[PDB]
């Protein structure tokens, strides 16, 4: 007695992976070529629609990851190549009768430098930081010898992280997930549907997140696996922690030609003092952070588990140690005043200092060469999340190096969707 | 509403939205082939419509009858009482049978009206 | 508990108009269609007009098919008939009766489920 | 004449023309995004077009009547006594309105038909 | 059988797989463009059968005569004892004439569909 | 077979100085010098 | 036997065979590969 009736423009959707267009309102980021923004970015509430979300299984958050990488190698390729600078360095300590803690960080070395003709070569003096240099038995060479060719980052290039809306192509959609306490898995009933998701930004850093969003009630904790301590632990705090980061001393950028038409940049001198680069934390401000981290981890672990905080195991800087870009300067800090305590039922200052030669994404192969910035810096910004890993008592330490879960803590509330609005239905009609 | 607005809602009542639904689902590489892809598949369902017969229509009817091994759950209980998310799946499996029995009674239908209209 | 309470009608002279009225409560009006049925003092009952349930589908008798409106009001949940050009045949009781067509997704009927009272006209 | 050959003409005149003027719509990366455009916006038009119950047509008309603000010209001494280029500003700021209206007026002729086919 | 099984066979037989024919017509910048130019090939072919009056329909017949000038073959010795693709070479010069023809007596059947309708 | 069309009875307004037509073969006309630049020798060599 | 003109002598012919003819090849001698860096990050490989 029913019929096949065949509808058209059905609101029914299956899960998908596609190319995701960006849009934002020079800098690494190619901002200028990411540019059909939209003013009114409409968002459309769904009522009685529950979906299941699963942020370790979403390809928005690889596709952001090749995007990031994409741009910043075709933003620093047209620049100065340092190849010229690959030579033996005669070194001296630029400060050799300081008794700080900056002694033996500054290295005063000379160079035998090309110059604009081919048949002359200048004498150079600059000052190295000590980790951009390896003794090779006076008698040094740059780090990046042993493994690349280094290329300078242009100085007319920002490296200030501006925010990009990733927008679905036509027959796609995007959908937020939306619920409080939302773990990263499983069904929000909360759900909307937008074009284009938020402006995220960029922000590249190891142990600490920086500037992302907060959780809106509570410290929430996600894992692909909470009992695997294979996986890492990402905590979204629900308050900021503000972190001001300093380079304490005023230095003075000189330039000199080393070929027709190129530059090379580089650190001159120091004016006035030299000390040692720093963060401050207040001290209050973190302890109760960490008492509402623990408080949450004992869901999982235990209300009668200690649980401690430690220092960070081993590896290269970008694990060991804090990382981020202030001012333009790449800075390490020493997170081991942060996580060292033990739970059981005024200011924190974290040495820093700062490195030219950077090995971006573990590509290896391909070195950059920050070029110094002139003057002193002061760089204030607050923590938002962390990144923890495992090793009666449980043992959290710092986590790190793998970029795409800095871009997880921001991208866990979206799936991508295709639109397959094509269906049948039985009807009591005919067609004649 | 808005776009996917009726997607929580019956399927009685989110039949009224197709025009919504329709308008949105039409507007270097990587983005020029999802472009040129997005095309092609609107194409596709546009050819597959008008193969079983239906052409500007957003909703038409034909004389495939269903099946009631089709899930036929009764008619009231799915257009009142279930969206068009739980209808995709009650049917998932059926949908090749169907389309291909929707272009079945399209060829025969043609063949007859050819022939009718050779009548004097 | 169904609502159908018709109004209106009297004594109109031949060649006259009128209009019914129906007003309901009870039953998602909007939900069904609606008809009109005659009932002439020795006939008993005779179909006389039909609208659907959104008020944009009519169908008529043959007797009225020029003279009559049938009419649908579904933020007011009342029905209403316009009589025209009244003639002596057209003398009967006039009930507002729910059922007839349906949507063509809910069970197609062709029955009535439920009566009012009926208004008087006579020409 | 050929194509854009009757631009200067009358409403009138130039209706006759609609052929000429559709057949020439339709047929390295940006040489390539250029087409593709194309191709969308050729899309675009036709599926508002079938939207609004007019599909392999080139003049097909509605219920929807000309309301007397949308620029009230007379009808016979305009329509042979302009050009579309003219009459395209006469009416600029009203093709919002009148193309909601062409969809809304269609909807309800869909539904008017699906339950009229459910008569037995 | 499958796409061009028919091939070898007369056209009366082949006139019944057109289904399967048009159903195998859809779906790095050599191959990007080549996928553009499909794509505009047949929106080309789409456009013309609606131009004709032929949209949603694999088989349409029309008021265009034929011209016995145009290989005259009888009409069963077309139809029960040749190939399409030896059809494709009978009138292989006349295919814009009769293209032509097909544009034509279309555009007076919309206008005389129009006066009718003005009709009260 | 460049065919034209007379616009018989269109009047048109022309601004040269806002016509992008002019920076498309700029930009045009650049790109294929530059990319004809590409395989050939260089000479920083000779910048003795 | 396929040739575009096999009366044209200088056109070549491609001769299909209708049965494999199996060839056995070999470099007889044990060769040691070393390798160079001869510059930051590349090196050079080379017969021992
Ligand atoms: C977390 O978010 C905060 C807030 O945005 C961000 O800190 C901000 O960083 C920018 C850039 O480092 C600071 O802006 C600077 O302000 C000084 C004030 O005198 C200006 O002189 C600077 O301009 C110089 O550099 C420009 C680079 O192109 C040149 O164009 C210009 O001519 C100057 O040379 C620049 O405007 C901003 O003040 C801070 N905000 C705060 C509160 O300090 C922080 O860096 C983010 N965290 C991380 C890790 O990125
Ligand atoms: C780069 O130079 C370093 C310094 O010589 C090489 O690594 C050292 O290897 C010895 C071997 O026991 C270790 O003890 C040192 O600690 C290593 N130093 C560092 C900084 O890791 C390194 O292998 C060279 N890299 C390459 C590609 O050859
Ligand atoms: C989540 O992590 C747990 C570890 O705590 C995984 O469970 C282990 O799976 C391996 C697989 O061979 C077993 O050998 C272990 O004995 C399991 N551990 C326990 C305590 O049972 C678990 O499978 C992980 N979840 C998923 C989906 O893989
Ligand atoms: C972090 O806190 C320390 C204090 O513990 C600040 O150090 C003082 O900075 C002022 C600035 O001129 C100096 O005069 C004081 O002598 C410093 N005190 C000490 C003990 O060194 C430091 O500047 C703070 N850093 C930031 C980034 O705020
Ligand atoms: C790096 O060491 C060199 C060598 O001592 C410093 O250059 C000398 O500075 C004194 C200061 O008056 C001059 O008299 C010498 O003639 C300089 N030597 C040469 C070879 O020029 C150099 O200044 C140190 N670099 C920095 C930044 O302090
Ligand atoms: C409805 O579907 C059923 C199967 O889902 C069809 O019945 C099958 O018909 C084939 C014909 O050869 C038989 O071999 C199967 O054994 C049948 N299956 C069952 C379960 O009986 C049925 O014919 C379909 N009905 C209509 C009206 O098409
Ligand atoms: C023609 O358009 C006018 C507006 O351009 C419509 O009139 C408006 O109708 C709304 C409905 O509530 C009123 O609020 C406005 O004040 C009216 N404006 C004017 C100027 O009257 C008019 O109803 C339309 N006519 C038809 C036949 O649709
Ligand atoms: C069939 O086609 C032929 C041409 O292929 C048409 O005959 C021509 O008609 C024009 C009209 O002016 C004459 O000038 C030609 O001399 C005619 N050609 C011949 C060979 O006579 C013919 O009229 C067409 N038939 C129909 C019914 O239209
Ligand atoms: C195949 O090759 C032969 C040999 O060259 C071509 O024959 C020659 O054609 C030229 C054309 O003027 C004559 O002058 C020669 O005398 C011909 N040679 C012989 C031996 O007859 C032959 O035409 C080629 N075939 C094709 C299809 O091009
Ligand atoms: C290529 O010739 C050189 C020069 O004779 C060989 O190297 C010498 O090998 C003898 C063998 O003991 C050494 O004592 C010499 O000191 C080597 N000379 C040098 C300069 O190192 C070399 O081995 C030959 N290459 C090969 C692959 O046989
Ligand atoms: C530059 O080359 C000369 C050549 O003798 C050498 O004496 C001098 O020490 C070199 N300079 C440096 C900085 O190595
Ligand atoms: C997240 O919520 C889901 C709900 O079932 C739960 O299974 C999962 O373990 C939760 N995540 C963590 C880290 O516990
Ligand atoms: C750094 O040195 C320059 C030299 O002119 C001076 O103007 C500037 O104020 C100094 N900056 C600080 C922070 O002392
Ligand atoms: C960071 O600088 C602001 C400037 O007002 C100051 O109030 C705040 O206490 C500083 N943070 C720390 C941890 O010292
Ligand atoms: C952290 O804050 C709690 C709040 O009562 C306090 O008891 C605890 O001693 C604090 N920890 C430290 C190390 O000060
Ligand atoms: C931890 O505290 C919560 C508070 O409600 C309680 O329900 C839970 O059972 C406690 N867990 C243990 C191990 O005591
Ligand atoms: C950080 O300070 C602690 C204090 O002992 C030290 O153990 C650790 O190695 C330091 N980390 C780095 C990267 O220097
Ligand atoms: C951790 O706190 C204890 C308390 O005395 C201190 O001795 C130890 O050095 C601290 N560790 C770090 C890495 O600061
Ligand atoms: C610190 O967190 C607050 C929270 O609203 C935010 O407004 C502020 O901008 C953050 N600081 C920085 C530097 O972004
Ligand atoms: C969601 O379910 C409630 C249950 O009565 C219903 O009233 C509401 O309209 C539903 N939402 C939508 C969009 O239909
Ligand atoms: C089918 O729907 C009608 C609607 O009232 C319901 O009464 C009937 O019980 C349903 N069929 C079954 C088997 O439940
Ligand atoms: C179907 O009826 C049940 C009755 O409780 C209701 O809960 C359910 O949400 C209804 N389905 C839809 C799609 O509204
Ligand atoms: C489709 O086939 C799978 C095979 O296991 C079955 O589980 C599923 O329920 C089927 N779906 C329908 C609509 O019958
Ligand atoms: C141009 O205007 C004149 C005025 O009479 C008219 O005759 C002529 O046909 C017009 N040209 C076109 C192309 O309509
Ligand atoms: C309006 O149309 C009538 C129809 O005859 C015409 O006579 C009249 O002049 C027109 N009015 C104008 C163009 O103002
Ligand atoms: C309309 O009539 C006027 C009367 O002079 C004429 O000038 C004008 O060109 C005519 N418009 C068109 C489009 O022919
Ligand atoms: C459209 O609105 C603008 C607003 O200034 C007005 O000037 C223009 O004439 C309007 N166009 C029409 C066709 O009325
Ligand atoms: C091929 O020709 C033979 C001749 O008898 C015919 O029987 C056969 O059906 C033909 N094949 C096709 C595919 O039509
Ligand atoms: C041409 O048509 C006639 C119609 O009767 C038929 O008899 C004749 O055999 C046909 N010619 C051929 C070659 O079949
Ligand atoms: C048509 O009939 C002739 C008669 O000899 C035959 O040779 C030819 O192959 C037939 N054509 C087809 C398509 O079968
Ligand atoms: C098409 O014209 C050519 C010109 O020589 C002729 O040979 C061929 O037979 C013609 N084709 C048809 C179908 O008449
Ligand atoms: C290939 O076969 C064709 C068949 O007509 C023949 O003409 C040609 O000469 C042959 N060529 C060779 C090289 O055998
Ligand atoms: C080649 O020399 C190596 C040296 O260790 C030896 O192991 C290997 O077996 C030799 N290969 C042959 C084929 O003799």
């Known amino acids: 007695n029913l019929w096949v009736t065949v509808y058209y423009g059905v609101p029914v959707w299956k899960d998908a992976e596609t190319t995701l267009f960006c849009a934002s309102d020079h800098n690494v980021w190619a901002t200028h070529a990411c540019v059909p923004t939209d003013p009114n970015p409409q968002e459309i509430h769904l009522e009685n629609v529950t979906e299941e979300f699963n942020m370790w299984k979403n390809n928005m958050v690889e596709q952001m990851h090749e995007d990031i990488i994409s741009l910043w190698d075709q933003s620093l390729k047209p620049c100065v190549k340092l190849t010229p600078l690959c030579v033996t360095l005669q070194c001296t300590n630029y400060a050799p009768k300081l008794r700080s803690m900056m002694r033996g960080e500054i290295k005063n070395c000379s160079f035998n430098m090309t110059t604009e003709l081919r048949d002359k070569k200048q004498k150079v003096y600059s000052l190295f930081y000590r980790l951009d240099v390896v003794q090779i038995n006076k008698e040094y060479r740059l780090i990046n010898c042993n493994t690349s060719a280094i290329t300078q980052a242009c100085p007319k290039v920002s490296f200030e992280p501006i925010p990009i809306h990733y927008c679905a192509p036509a027959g796609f959609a995007i959908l937020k997930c939306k619920d409080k306490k939302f773990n990263g898995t499983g069904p929000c009933p909360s759900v909307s549907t937008v074009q284009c998701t938020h402006g995220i930004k960029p922000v590249v850093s190891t142990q600490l997140l920086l500037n992302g969003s907060l959780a809106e009630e509570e410290v929430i904790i996600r894992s692909e696996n909470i009992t695997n301590n294979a996986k890492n632990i990402l905590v979204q705090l629900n308050t900021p922690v503000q972190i001001n980061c300093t380079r304490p001393s005023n230095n003075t950028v000189k330039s000199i030609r080393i070929g027709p038409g190129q530059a090379f940049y580089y650190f001159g001198d120091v004016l006035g003092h030299v000390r040692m680069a720093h963060c401050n934390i207040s001290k209050a401000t973190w302890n109760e952070t960490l008492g509402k981290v623990v408080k949450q981890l004992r869901k999982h672990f235990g209300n009668n588990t200690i649980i401690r905080f430690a220092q960070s195991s081993g590896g290269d800087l970008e694990v060991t140690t804090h990382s981020f870009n202030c001012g333009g300067e790449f800075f390490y800090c020493n997170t081991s005043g942060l996580f060292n305590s033990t739970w059981i039922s005024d200011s924190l200052i974290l040495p820093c200092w700062i490195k030219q030669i950077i090995n971006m994404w573990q590509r290896i192969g391909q070195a950059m060469y920050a070029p110094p910035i002139q003057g002193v810096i002061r760089c204030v910004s607050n923590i938002t999340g962390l990144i923890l890993t495992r090793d009666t008592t449980e043992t959290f330490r710092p986590g790190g190096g793998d970029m795409r879960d800095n871009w997880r803590s921001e991208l866990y509330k979206y799936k991508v969707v295709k639109i397959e609005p094509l269906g049948v239905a039985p009807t009591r009609c005919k067609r004649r | 509403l808005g776009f996917l607005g009726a997607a929580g809602s019956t399927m009685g009542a989110a039949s009224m939205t197709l025009t919504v639904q329709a308008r949105n689902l039409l507007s270097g590489i990587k983005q020029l082939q999802a472009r040129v892809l997005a095309v092609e598949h609107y194409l596709r369902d546009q050819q597959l419509l008008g193969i079983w017969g239906c052409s500007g229509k957003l909703i038409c009817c034909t004389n495939v009858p269903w099946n009631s091994s089709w899930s036929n759950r009764n008619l009231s209980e799915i257009w009142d009482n279930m969206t068009w998310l739980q209808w995709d799946k009650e049917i998932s499996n059926y949908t090749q049978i169907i389309y291909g029995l929707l272009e079945e009674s399209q060829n025969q239908q043609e063949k007859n009206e050819q022939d009718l209209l050779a009548l004097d | 508990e169904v609502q159908l309470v018709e109004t209106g009608g009297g004594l109109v002279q031949p060649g006259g108009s009128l209009k019914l009225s129906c007003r309901a409560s009870?039953?998602?009006?909007?939900?069904?269609?609606m008809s009109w049925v005659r009932q002439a003092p020795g006939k008993g009952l005779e179909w006389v007009s039909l609208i659907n349930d959104r008020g944009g589908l009519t169908f008529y008798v043959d007797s009225v098919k020029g003279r009559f409106t049938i009419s649908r009001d579904n933020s007011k949940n009342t029905l209403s008939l316009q009589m025209h050009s009244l003639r002596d045949g057209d003398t009967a009781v006039y009930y507002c009766?729910?059922?007839?067509?349906?949507?063509?997704?809910?069970?197609?009927?062709?029955?009535?489920?439920?009566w009012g009272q009926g208004a008087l006209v006579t020409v | 004449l050929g194509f854009l050959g009757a631009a200067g003409s009358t409403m009138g005149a130039a209706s006759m023309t609609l052929t000429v003027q559709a057949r020439n719509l339709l047929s390295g990366i940006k040489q390539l995004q250029a087409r593709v455009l194309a191709v969308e916006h050729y899309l675009r038009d036709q599926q508002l077009l079938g939207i609004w119950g007019c599909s392999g047509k080139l003049i097909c008309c509605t219920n929807v009547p000309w309301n007397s603000s949308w620029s009230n010209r007379n009808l016979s001494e305009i329509w042979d006594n302009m050009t579309w280029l003219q009459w395209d500003k006469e009416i600029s700021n009203y093709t919002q309105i009148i193309y909601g209206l062409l969809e809304e007026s269609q909807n309800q002729q869909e539904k008017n038909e699906q339950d009229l086919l459910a008569l037995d | 059988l499958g796409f061009l099984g028919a091939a070898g066979s007369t056209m009366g037989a082949a006139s019944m797989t057109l289904t399967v024919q048009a159903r195998n017509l859809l779906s790095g910048i050599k191959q990007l463009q080549a996928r553009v130019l499909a794509v505009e090939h047949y929106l080309r072919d789409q456009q013309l059968l609606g131009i004709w009056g032929c949209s949603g329909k694999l088989i349409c017949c029309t008021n265009v005569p034929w011209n016995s000038s145009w290989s005259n073959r009888n009409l069963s010795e077309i139809w029960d004892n040749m190939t399409w693709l030896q059809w494709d070479k009978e009138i292989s010069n006349y295919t814009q004439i009769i293209y032509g023809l097909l544009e034509e007596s279309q555009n007076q059947q919309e206008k005389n569909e129009q006066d009718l309708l003005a009709l009260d | 077979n460049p065919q034209e069309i007379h616009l018989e009875n269109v009047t048109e307004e022309f601004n040269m100085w806002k016509n992008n037509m002019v920076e498309q073969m700029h930009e045009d006309i650049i790109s294929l010098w530059d990319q004809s630049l590409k395989p050939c020798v260089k000479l920083t060599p000779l910048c003795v | 036997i396929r040739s575009e003109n096999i009366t044209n002598n200088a056109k070549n012919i491609l001769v299909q065979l209708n049965t494999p003819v199996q060839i056995n090849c070999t470099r007889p001698s044990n060769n040691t590969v070393k390798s160079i860096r001869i510059g930051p990050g590349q090196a050079f490989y080379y017969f021992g």
């Open positions: 009870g039953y998602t009006f909007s939900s069904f269609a």
């Open positions: 009766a729910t059922g007839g067509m349906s949507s063509a997704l809910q069970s197609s009927k062709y029955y009535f489920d439920f």
